[PDB]
Every structure is written in structure tokens, then in C-alpha cells.
Design a protein around this ligand. Sequence first.
Ligand code: NI
Ligand code: NI
Ligand code: NI
Ligand code: NI
Ligand code: NI
Ligand code: NI
Lengths: 100, 100, 566, 566, 566, 101
Amino acid sequence: MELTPREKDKLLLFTAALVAERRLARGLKLNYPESVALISAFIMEGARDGKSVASLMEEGRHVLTREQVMEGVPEMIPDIQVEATFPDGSKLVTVHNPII
Amino acid sequence: MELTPREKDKLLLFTAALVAERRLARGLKLNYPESVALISAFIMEGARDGKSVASLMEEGRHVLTREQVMEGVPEMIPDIQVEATFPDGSKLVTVHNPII
Amino acid sequence: SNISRQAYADMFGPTVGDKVRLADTELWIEVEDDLTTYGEEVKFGGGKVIRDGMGQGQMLAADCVDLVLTNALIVDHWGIVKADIGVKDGRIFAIGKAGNPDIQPNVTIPIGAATEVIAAEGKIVTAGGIDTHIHWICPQQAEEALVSGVTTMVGGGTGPAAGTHATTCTPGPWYISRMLQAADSLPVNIGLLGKGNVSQPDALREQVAAGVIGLKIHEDWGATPAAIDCALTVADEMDIQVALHSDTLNESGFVEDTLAAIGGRTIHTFHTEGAGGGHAPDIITACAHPNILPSSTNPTLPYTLNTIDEHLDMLMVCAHLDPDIAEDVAFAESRIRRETIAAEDVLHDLGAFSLTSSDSQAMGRVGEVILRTWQVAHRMKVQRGALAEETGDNDNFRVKRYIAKYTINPALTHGIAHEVGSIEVGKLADLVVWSPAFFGVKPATVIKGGMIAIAPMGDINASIPTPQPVHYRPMFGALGSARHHCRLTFLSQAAAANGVAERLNLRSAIAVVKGCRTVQKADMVHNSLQPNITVDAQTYEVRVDGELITSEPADVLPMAQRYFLF
Amino acid sequence: SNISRQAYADMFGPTVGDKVRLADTELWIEVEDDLTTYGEEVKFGGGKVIRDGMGQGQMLAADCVDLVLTNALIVDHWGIVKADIGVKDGRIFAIGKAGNPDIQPNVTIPIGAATEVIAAEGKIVTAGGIDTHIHWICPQQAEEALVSGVTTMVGGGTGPAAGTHATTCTPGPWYISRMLQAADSLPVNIGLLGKGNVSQPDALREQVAAGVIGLKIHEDWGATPAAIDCALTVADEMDIQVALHSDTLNESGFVEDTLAAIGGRTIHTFHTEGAGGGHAPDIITACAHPNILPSSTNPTLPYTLNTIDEHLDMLMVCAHLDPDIAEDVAFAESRIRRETIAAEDVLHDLGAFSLTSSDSQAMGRVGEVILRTWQVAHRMKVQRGALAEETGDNDNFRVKRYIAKYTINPALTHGIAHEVGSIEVGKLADLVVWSPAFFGVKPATVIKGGMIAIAPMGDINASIPTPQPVHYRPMFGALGSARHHCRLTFLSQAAAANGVAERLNLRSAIAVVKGCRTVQKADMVHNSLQPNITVDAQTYEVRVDGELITSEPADVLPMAQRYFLF
Amino acid sequence: SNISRQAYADMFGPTVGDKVRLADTELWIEVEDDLTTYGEEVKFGGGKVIRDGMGQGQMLAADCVDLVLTNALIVDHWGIVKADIGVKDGRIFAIGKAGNPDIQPNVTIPIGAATEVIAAEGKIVTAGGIDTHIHWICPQQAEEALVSGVTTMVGGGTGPAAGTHATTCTPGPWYISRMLQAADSLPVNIGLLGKGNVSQPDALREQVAAGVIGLKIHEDWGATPAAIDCALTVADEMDIQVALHSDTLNESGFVEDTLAAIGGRTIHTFHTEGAGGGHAPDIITACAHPNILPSSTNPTLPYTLNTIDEHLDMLMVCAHLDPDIAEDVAFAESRIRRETIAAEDVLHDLGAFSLTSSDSQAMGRVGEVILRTWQVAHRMKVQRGALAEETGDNDNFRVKRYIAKYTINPALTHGIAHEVGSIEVGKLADLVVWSPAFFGVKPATVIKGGMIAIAPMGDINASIPTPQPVHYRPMFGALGSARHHCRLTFLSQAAAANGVAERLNLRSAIAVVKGCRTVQKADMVHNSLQPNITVDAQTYEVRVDGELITSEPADVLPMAQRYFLF
Amino acid sequence: MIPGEYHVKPGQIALNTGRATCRVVVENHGDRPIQVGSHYHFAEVNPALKFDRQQAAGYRLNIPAGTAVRFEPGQKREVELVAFAGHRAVFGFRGEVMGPL
Ligand code: NI
Ligand code: NI
Ligand code: NI
Ligand code: NI
Ligand code: NI
Ligand code: NI
């Protein structure tokens, strides 16, 4: 595989997302780290599919709503940022006020 | 659990395989690292079940086909090797030209 | 006897006339020369050539090399040739024909009892990359860079602090001393840049005397004509380089005023295209001057479909700006221009821009300097075709022009070319071994000072080094004292003379920078063009000799989704 | 001109009169003072104030600070004020108004070419925590503690061995020497405790001469009146502190006998509530004496619903007990008492208990010393309301009282307050930067000796430091020699004089403990209460002046499920 | 009073006459002796024996041990006994009865204020393993080996380079010096092997003078009679060991010619069975000679169902062979023989083969040397029953015979038995503590030079060291200077005399090898058989005194799927 | 498109040109296989191979570098040799020359 440090680091993010993904499935209100991880992993898969940066900046605001997270969590996340390999190389996706 | 460094290292492989496994489910054509990880994890579970080295050397060539991976990927993988604990201890499984 | 060319290729790697495509790009190189004697190639293994009395001689250590890279395909600014590489005392000893003079002809690289062997047949060997725009935001950047193929890192910083997030400056004696001590722990050659923004010369001399090999003028600390003039004066008397990031706001004057302040003195302009910083919107015109050594930072290389979208938002978090404050956002659009972003790629292809760097964690990707340089080459071949200098049906010249951008050119610009920057005898043995399919993306081996420092490694408990999982792990060349012995900390001539290494009790090898004031655009290997370039103040259109310079954004690039897991 | 208070807050952080809630607790602090001159605040960035000739002067390194923390909101035992923090030579230089005297008024902290900047506007800055009850069970405890905001660790141990699992003792010269050498590799200030249980004075003197800054009397090694008397005698002649864990079994006598053996000599009582060890069931009465410096260990802080259930089982694995042997379990119920567990929280709120510690991996959580101290504060405000000392509509006094428990008080108790423990000029620059929303839970930056040692860091290959995943990674202040230069190994005056640092060839900075015998309860900042406390031998009820002291168990706490992934 | 044997076992571990099964194997050991005085056993904990004035005395540091392993069940080549182990100055002080002479009888190991305690009741203690066939392909191999219970590693290499992938050779002065410096960073004792394939004596002397403790003759570098003779001549004059991997191709002669070249001089034959290398197909006959010290590499131990299948493919990647080239594959079948693979297991059981090693990442598993040795013992008991030397209804002799294979025998073979190899007074305290259920698989504690270096450790922030996840983490004995003090770098007498340690500025303790030329087969503890063994040139059948030597392949083995996650 | 693919021009490479060569009939009289490397001094191969050792003096096999010729027991075959170059000094092998020639 020849995994570089950055690829191995993203495996940590992906695994953190698996944790949140299951808790949301149970119907729990997600906390701070669970929310950032869930929305971040969504964006990474978005890039893998070849969606544009512009598309993800928008779709990323519809992953979790205010009624799916704990009190005060939406304000603790003014934005979320993550990079992934798009068809045209590494790009940065910034999602402002992701939870509403 | 008393996990040794080698057991912890395999957890990285297993997790890399989870990534590929989902992308294949989406119907994406797998890239280089995703392919090596997917086929490798298959073999590890094979050993866990108690399949012989000879059996896995063959079954490992039928995990992914040429139409399920990106262009040029089958040639980037002339073989795949992985070790796992079989009923009779650690053994090495070599799969030649796994993707066809 | 006789052997077919294909079987030969499979056994000893390609020879004269054979072509090899670089990774998954449209770039093809052709072996220009082979320094071997057919039938006398050295190969390692059971029953092979390198054995006592055969390809291995009876000479003592002093008369043979320590390491030999067999059947290597060298790609460097001077040629794309097949030959053996001999390494002795951590330095490139020779490039020739390895073997035993006792029984073999034309041996220039003797193999003895004391010689280790690295089999490079079927592999491409290149010098280690040199990134001169590093922000020391975190120590983890070194391993990242090393894994990508960059063996030398020049920049400034003190860690994740506002000043370093924004600028490449290790402020003052205390932080310089501290960072020089921390550098011994890192597996790459390091040189530090101090804060050059001051109108008092002594405040700069102290920093150079403390140990920095250059000074960074950054607009966030005030890139005024007085500050610039001051830094260049001390640079001229201490033989150190100046890196510039000009006044984007045009607060103290326009590009022509900064250029006037510089007064024809030598200077390395960071991110010359401007997105990463500089006079809006014509900082790019600097590439026309003989005293300017221009470089690009990597997020704009090459021009793609998602480039502009990603940029508006990135340029905020870096400079510590505010989207609510109009003045903090009005220049964002003046700083990010599609027009100059597209011209930059073309300017590299022409040799107008001479270096590529990252701008690590401050609008740049530390592990993508090599990767993006080749992506630009691929895209330019696709769009513009062959270069006027090409000869034969290959891309050899374009490859030499682009590889020089992150190897020899950065070394010349910062006065370290006497130590690193290329595969030439006498230079430190910082080499990278690549498999053609992963060229520019994932190295097979990264050698520092004659010792492998990082390489892909499989299951540690496996019966061989190849079983999964295979990921990059630190080797012996990155351990304690072995590392100290295989890396260089670059000091200024003043610091060296002052006994800084002894005072801080530095453990690594020490090198000294020199020749920073005499280099000019004409000295940049394969990239010495001085175009008559203009920028339209309103349309932002870039023009060279009246003709419009532009390019189209890529939708898909090589060295991307086929190699990475994320 | 004029600026509204809200916009001002968003730009430079809160000012006089503004309140900020700490994390998700019910605690509110109010800025008591602001040391700036309105309109002259220093801010870093493009076009901002800190630029040559503007907010940055022309002075040489010796005349300006090395690091400046701009617009900081300081929370310390002495005040909750807004000001700039200047750091020079790894020490707190000043707390005032930073800038350039050339063009700005009231500058007490000069910024020059050699000054690095850390933007603290909108952030809370506090001293580094000090945990004095560490069991050196594993080296990994240091990073854990550092990430939580604890910069100094005092304790004893030799690794995961039965003796260390149970007690904070580095037994004898050999293990002391070995652990002192190992300490150079850790990114926190360290002081060691030896085994103080001996009735032969010379066996103790040797340990102090070997390097320990204190001695631990633990019942597992025999906390008899003879052992106690012996340790205190040597402590008195060598100026080192004694930490006690008394005879729980009442084998040699009751609490009053131990107190008699102590004879009014200075002593730090570990886990004074008793669950973590001590005379059953009245070891808590010790907090009434002027010579006793009482502390709590953290698993009992604060009293919650799952506290008792978890405790019965935890108290087994630690002391190396057996659930089958009746005598090994009969005292479990005598040691874990709801009555004293509830009184402890109240006693902290009143200032009867003066310190908080962990008791790492031996009935304590190394990374939760700060976290739990604030949870107790929150719970006490909720139950008891405002403290008699409060002034204004805020919780400023309660905050000062509780922060002192893990900062200055532990430093006074162990004779290191001359070096660390608070933000006061001359003290080592061990500072922690917090974002109000994560106060007490997850630090934005942890500074050791003037260098960032650990901080949250995102994707290393990213274009900025913020992209995911963001987790704590070691910085330059934690690397080789830079670390040695930014950390302190505390020695006893005897060891220092004997040349122990030179003999073991210790690489870090060395500090010496002093003033361990003269501190008394009256010296504990904000926590000097000596209550007339009694414990009912049968009901275990705690009473102060006849009134019953108790509290209710919490079902949910702040700084818990909203911040952690597991 | 009186106590039943079962309760006694549960409290202090098994005593004389009690049996314990090793892990999940069919092997049973029986306590042969107990050195305690019933009722006077020392136990640590609250209310237990080791307390001031009781089981702990008043003696100064010089008169008591630093560490005491209480109630240990020792398994060594000399006995399987119950006793206390005293460690002083990093060395085994005594094996006897620990306590306080003041009030206890028969105390030979005094416990004082300076004594740390490790509770070994119910645990098995053994010496640290010694692997003499290490390929330094990556530094990560050390932690892997340490975790398995191997405390000393002897081999050669320079990292992941072709030469090292294939051979255990650190080629020449430069690489030897570099690797010796890198060794200070590793937590295991290390000794290096140089490239012994040369027909010029001076090229070898230099390597020994540079620091190697032995020379490896490998067929890939030419294992010719001239090379062999040359290496043995220098070995004889410098007192260093020679490791051999003979001419598999029979190019320079057959096994009898190599044996002739050796001329009765001392030599350690690597992988004597032959699969891992050596004259095809009778290299195994070497075990019949008095001057040959034979060892096996681990992938062939023991003979199982998947052995042959896995081997054909493994033997390719290692030697750098090619499946297309007929000559590169024709000998694969000549090298991998079911006949010799089955005889090897039996030969170990008989004491014909004296050592076990790994052959790390070059046809061997670095973390399975101990594990596989016991799997062979289990399989041999199952197939052949009790050994002729067994006494009583136990497997004590077979256990002593097999444990010697990776402890004392490897130490004798390489001239380091004066320092390590067994639990005997005066030897370095390299000890491993095992829980009977995990014997040979996963250690409870690994002690290096008197300090725990690696051990299983649970949640770092937990209230105790046991909560999940529990995995192996480095301890204090593996940190900076503490590690340097607890590990040994073995030098040759020449290098030591030449001042190599001082010149390279080596930080660890230094030991010197001696007695490499005088050891012979008769000196191998419990494994000195010299069978009249023959191999049929065609059928490859192994015969000892005419009788056929063979065994059946296992389908399932202990110490496998029940303990590992992958 | 195959990443890193070669485009080898067709043809052949002539090996060890301009050097003396000779042919020798060799036969393995041993009972175990023998394999000889390309650069091994032929005159000093395993004594079980019967051939004119006097003719093979200073010669090695004329085969591509790194390859080998195997001789099964009883195998008889004619091989082509090529003369050593350089200093023509043989050191090592069975130790029969250990000097020039
Ligand atoms: Ni810039
Ligand atoms: Ni920059
Ligand atoms: Ni305690
Ligand atoms: Ni404790
Ligand atoms: Ni071998
Ligand atoms: Ni080997």
C-alpha cells in the first residue's frame, strides 16, 4: 500500500466517524468530537466520488441538524475543514456553520 | 488483550480494508491502496477461519476483477502478500497476479 | 553471448534508447547513455556477480566505496543516464562502472568487503528535494516531507504560534538557538530564517550571528521600503539570502516601488504569482528582473477546476483575517486571480519561474512539492506540446527543466549548492529511489547522508519485508547519533565563526552557506528566462511581449486518485 | 473613534465588566481590570499593528521580549484581568501593555525584531497545573498530563512494579538515579519522592542526597509512629517535604496517635478524605491542624451517582488485595464511606482542603485533575450558592480559590513556588491557553519554558493547521535539547551541592526545592480554613462545629459527554 | 499454623511437587525445590510482610538489594525452583530467601528502604532470550523482539538494502560505526556481524577493529573455501565467532569440501536444516561434528501442514531470485525438502541441534523464536513421548533442554555468556516474567538491566493500570539515558582496546566478547549430541545410525489462534 | 496507460565483445546438482565436474551477468567460456591461483 503519514492520519478520522455513525443510528444526540468526525468523513467520501469543492461546501451543511446534536454543539463548530484527494489532486473544503 | 506491535499493525490493515469495502459497495472502481488492502484483509479472515495456505493462494485471485479497479491498477500489483495466524501458527500467503 | 533488449530490460533495467513513462503521466524519458560494459554489469544475489574474487575485490575500506547503487537510472538536471552510483563517507563518490578491477574491465567504482549493495536496476534515482519555504508550525512536517522525497528544509518558525502561522520567521537569538537545538532531532537538513523586518541593522546582524542563513521580509511584520533596504544591506555584508513577501495592500507603494527599494540587489521572491502574497495584482512582474530568483508555492500548481473555490476560503485562516470586516475580505478577490493563476503554469514551462516550494501549512502542502511540479509538467505537455529545446521523441529536456526547480535551483538560491542539490561527486549522498510507476508519488527508498532514513516497510514480524501492511517507517539513518551524523544544520559564516555549534552543543554535522549575494536569474539551471511581462491593472491579464499568457484548468490529474487512500 | 462593546469583544476579547462562562459550567468570571490603552491594543496580521516602526520597535534583543501573548484574559489566584504577557529567557517578564515606545503610550512590554507573537485575544491564559501525587507507573502519563494542562509532576516510582502500583516511592539511590536520568526525556518538570518508611535516619538521608525532593510514608511499607517520626526528623534537617498515607487498619494506633507522632511538624497529607487511604474512618479530621497541608485525589471529586459503585471494586486491584480473604475486604467498606465522600466537596468549597491531585493509576486519573476541580466548583455553586467572600454578580472569588488548588498551593507545599505555580514575573513560563468553550477540558496551547510543547494539530500535509483530523501532537518544545532547555528537574539542596546533576550527566535545567518545613495551613492561598471538624465513629457523619457537612450526588456533570469521544 | 496446599498455591504460587501446564501446551513442569521457610514468605501490600521493622530492614543501600522478585518460579537450564530473586546494580545478586535478618530466619536477600518490589507469586521467571540471527532490516524489529521476550540481538545489516535483505552483514568500518551509534537508541543488547567473505585478511581485521563481534559468511557474497578459510583465520586470532551460510549451489564443492575448508575450527552454522540456506541437500550433516554449533531458523519450526506451501514462495523474495529464470527456480525444490524439515524437529528433541533463532525478515519471524521453540517441544512430546533423561512424571528435562536453545547456548556460541544468557549471580538482570497461561506467548513484564523496559499497559488515564485497552508500551528502562545504562553494546576485544566506544562517543554500557574459539558442541547445555547422521542424495531421507528420522506435520498448534487477534 | 511502463526498442545486445572465448565439454560426475555463476573462475569449480581445467584457466562462463548454468548429476554439456579481463588476477575461489593469470 505504501501508506504515507497523511493517509494513516485520515484512517484515524474515518474510524472516529464510524463511532459517531453508530451512535447516531442508535438515535443519540451527537457531541462535539462525534459531529466534527461525522461531517468530515462525509466530505472525504465526497471527494473520492469526484464531487467538486463547491458542491461539498454546500452538501456538508446538511449532514446533521440542530436537533441531532447535544445542546451548545452547533456554536462550538463555526466551521469544519478537511482535505482529500479529488480527481484533480488535494483540495480543501471549508463548510461554514455546518449545523443549523 | 495484551496486543503486541504486530497485532496493532494489522488493525491498520483491517481499517484500510473497511474504507475500500465501502467504496466498492458504492460501485466505485478501486485504486491501488484500496485494492491491496481489500484483498489482504480477505486473506487474513481466511486464515482465521482455518483455510489452508494453498486454498487462499487461489481464492485470493478472485476477490476483485479488472473491471472493478482503476486503469493500470492490476499491473501495479504483480502479487500480494500477507501473514496471519492459522490453526498451525503464522504462515505467509502469496497471491500472484491477484487482479485479472 | 546475446540477449534480447526486453529480457535485458527486465534483468538490468532499461538501456540507451529505451523509454519509460513517469508514473501515470504523459511524460516519457529516454535513456541518453549507459556507462556499463555489456555482460559486465554487477548484480547482487546468490550466484550473482558481487561475490568474493568476482565482482567484489580484495581492497581495504579506504580503496572501495561504502555503498553501491547498482544499475541506476539517474534523472538529474545534467542527464538521464544509466550507471552505478558509488557512495563513500556519506558523499557521492562516483557515477560510473562498479566492480572488481582484478577481473573486470573499466571499473571506476571498486566494490570490496566493506561495500553494502542497493539494487537499483529498474529504478529511477534522483537527488533529494529541497524546500525553501517551510513554516515550522509542527515538527511532524519533517517526516511528511522526507517521505515525499524532500531531504532539505529551509524556513523559519517557533511552532504553532500566530507569527509562524503567518510567516517563515524564527524571531531572535533565543528562538533561533532553541530551534537550532531542536533541529538535531529531525531527519532532514535544516537552515533557519530570521525576522528581517526592521529598520535597525544591528537587530538583524544579531540574528545572523545567532545562526540564521537568511531573513524573511513579510508584509505582516511590515514589508516597507525601509525594512527591505535594511535587510538587503545586512544580507550583502553577511552573505545570506533574503526571502520576500511584499506589500499586498500597496500601502507603502506599488510593485515598482518595492523593486526600487531592492535596487538590483539579489533576492528570492516567495510565491511570485501572488495568491500566496504580494502586491495586488502585479507582483508577478518581478520574474523579469536579473536579480530576482522567483518561486511558486504549491497549492496553485497546477491550475485546476477546484483551485479558485478552495482558495477564497484558505486565504483567511492563514493571514489571520476576518470575513465580516470588509477590508479584510475586499483584497481576497484582489489577491486570488484566475488570470495570474493560469499564467504561472505557462511561466514555469518557459523557465520564467525557477523554483517550486510548499509554504507548509500556510497556504501550501508540505508533502506535495515534487508531486505538483510533475503535475504542472504533465499539464503543460498536454497543452503546449514539446518545448523548443526538446530533441528526439521524448520529454527529456522538459524533465531536466522541472526537476531543477526543486533540487539544484533552490540550493543555488540559498547558498547550499556546494553541499546538496544534485547528484554530483562530493555532494552529500541525499538520494531517493523510485519505482517508475510511483515516480514523484511514493519513494521506494530515501537515503540521507549515505544511510536509508525512511522507506516502505511491511509486517515487522513477517518472514520477509514485503507482506502487508506496508507503510513508511523510520530507519536507522533517523536514529539518535546515526541521524546526527547523516544530517546537516546550515549556519551563517558568522555563527560558524562565533562558535554557535559548540556553544549550543549541536550534535549534527555543520555546513555553512555562501554565495547568496552573487546568484542571479542567469544562474538558475534551465530556468533563466527574463520575459518582458506585463499585467493589466484592471483585467489582470498577463502578457509577455504583448501576447496573452494563459492556460485551461484541469478536471483530472495524474499522481492523484490512483495512488492515495484518502 | 468609538466602537461598540460587542464589536470590541469580538476583536480584542472581553474587557472590564464583561462576563464569560467557563466551558459548559454555571461558573461565570468577570474581567476585573484591563491594562491596555483603548485604541492602542497590539494585534498581529497583515495590515495590523505589530509591524516595523509601528507596534514593533527598533530595540535589540536584550531590550525586548522573546514572546508576547497579546490581549490575554488572565485567570490566576491574584486576579482575573486583561493584559499582554511578555516572556523573556523562558520566564515571565511582565504583565502589562505591549508595543513600541517610539510611537505608542504606556508600553511596558517592548516588541522588537526578536519577538514572536501568540494571539490570545478571546482566550484565557492560566499557569500550568502542578500534580503532586504521581505514581510513575508508565512514562506515557506525562503526555497525558501535559495535554490536560499540567506542566509539573511530582511523585515516585520505577515503572509498573508492585511497589509503585501501590506507592509513590522511588526506592533508593540506584532507582532514584535511573529515574532522574529518564526524566530528561519527559516534557514536564519533575521532582521525585523516595521511600520514607524506615526507622534508621541514614537510609533516608542517602535517598535525599541521591536526589529526591521529598519522602512518601505509605502504610504498605509500614506507616508506624517510628517510621513517621524518622522521616520528619530527616525532612526537618534537609528541607524536603513529607507526603503521608496513614495506617488505615489502625494497627499501630488511631488517627490521634499518628497526629501525635507528627508532633506539629509540617506534612502534606495525601487523599485526606480517606477513600484513597488513611485511618478508618476519621483521617479527614487532619484538615483542622495548622501544620497539615491537605489534598484530595481526584476520583472522589465531585460526589456523583456512580462514585460508590465504582469505588468498591477499584479499591482492590490497587492495594493488591483479595476479595476472598475476609480481612482483605472487611475494610473496603470501612474505607469507602458516602459520608466523608460528600463532605469532601463542601470542605473544598470552604477552603478546608487546599490541594487537588490525581493519584495516577493508583485510584486516580492523571488527565483529570483540572477537569474535576472545576466540576466540584460547578457543583458547589449549584448547591451552596455564592461564597461569603464573593463580591459582585460573578464567581470570581470561587474561581481564584479553586484554581489555587492545583497551581500555587501545590507549589508552596513542595518548595518549588519560587520557580513555578503562577503567572508572576520571574517564574518559569509554563502557561496554558484555553478557548472559553473548552476551559478546563482541552487546551488550545501548552507552553513550557517559553516554547509550545504540545498543541492540537490538524492534517500535517494540509494547506493550513486547522483541517481534520485535529488531535494533540508534540511540538518543538518537546524535542531533544530544546526540551532539556525548557524543563526543570528539581533536586534537593544536598543533591545539588553533591554534584548529582553533573555525576548522572543530567541534561535539563536544574532547580532546587526550599521552604518545605516552614509552610503551614495559613500559607495556602485562599484555602487556609482550620475547621473544628469531627467524624462520628459509627455513623461516619462529618460535622464542623456541630453542624452536619454533606452534599448530594450529581447525575450529570459539565465537561463530560459533550467534549469526549469515549 | 497450617494451610492447605491449594490455598497456599493461590497465595504464594506453587511449591515443591505441584505441576503447572505451560500455556495451552501439553507440557507440564513440577517445582523441584522451594528455597523459602514456610510461614516466612515475603509478600507486598497493606498489612503484608514487607514493611518497616518487619520484612523490611534498617540496612543502608549498600547492604540490601535494589529490586526483589518475590515468590518466583524460576525455569532455567539448571532447575525449575521456587525462590526470591534479588537484583543489585542491574545484576542478579542472589537467588534465595528475601527478608529482614532482624526478625526472620534464613534471609540471604536483605530488603531495605532502598528496595523496590515486584510480586512474582504465581508467575514464571526466565532469562531474556538471545537471538543470534538478526537481519537489521528495520529498527522496529527490536521492540517486536523485546515484547516476545528476547533481550539480546546479534546480527548485521544497514537497513532495508539488498545486501541486508539477503545477509546478516554490516559491511565495513563506516556502516559498522554508524550502526553502533544507532544501537544506543534500541532497548536490547546488541552485537554486530561484519561481511566475512574476503580472501584478504586485512579487510576482515579492519571490520573487527571497527567493532564487530563476529563475521558472516554468506553464499550471496561467495561462500568459497578461500573466503571461509580466511574468515576462520582472523576469527582465530581475534577471538570472534563465525556464522556460516554455505554454498547451496555446490558450485565450489559439496558439503564435505566446506567442512574440509573449516578444518575443525569453531563455527556456528546458521539454519543447519538447509531450507534457509546451505549445500543442497545435505548441509544438515554438519550437526555431527564437534566444532560445529548448529542452529535452526524459525519458520520451519515445527513441521506443520502449511509449511511446504508457504516456503516455495518465500524462498524467492528473500534471495532476490526470479521465477522465470529456470536456474533461479530449479534449486528452490532442491532447497525445500519435506524430508529434512521433518527430521529437524526430532534432531532438536534429541539435542543434535543446539540453538533456535529467527532469521528476521529474511525467512524468519523476529517475534516467534520463543513461541516456536515451545511449539516444537509440545509436538515432540506428543509424538515421541518422554525423553530418556526424564525423571518423575513431568517434562522438566525436556523444558530445560529447549529453554537452553534460546538462552545459554546462544550466549556460549557468541562469547557473551559471561554477561547474559541465564539467571545466575553476576549476570545482567535481563529477566522476563510470565503468567503460566501466556508462557512463551505474551510476557507480563520484560526487565532490562534491572529496569522494566516494556510491559502490557492499560488506559493511561484510568484509575488503575488494568483497564482496556491493554497493549505493550515502552517503560522507563527504554528512555534516553536510563536505557543507555540498562543495555550493553558488545565490542570485540580489539575495538574495545582501540577506544572505539570513546571515539564514536557511545553512550551505553560496553561489554566484550571472549571465548568464541574454544566452545565446541560438547559445551552446548543439554544439546551436545553428535549423531552419526546421513542424508540420501536422491530421496533426501535423513538417517541416524541407519534408522530413519522423521515426524508428522501438525494441523493445529498451541500458542496460536487462542492468543492472537490476527 | 500502464504507470511506469517501458517502451524498449526491439533488437539485441551483444555481450562481452572483443574477448577470447573457448568451448569446453563438461560433465557432472557427482551425485548432487551443481550450479555455476557467471563470473566464477571456471577452473576452480566443484571437483566433481570433469573437464579440461587447463583450458578454462582464467576463464568464466560467457552468459549474461548474474545468470548460472546448472548441471544435474551425470549431466554432460558443452559450455562457452570468456576470458577474465581487468588485471587478470584471480583471488579466492578454491585458492588455486591467488595471483595474476
Ligand atoms: Ni507569504
Ligand atoms: Ni509562507
Ligand atoms: Ni495513598
Ligand atoms: Ni497513591
Ligand atoms: Ni542464510
Ligand atoms: Ni539470514
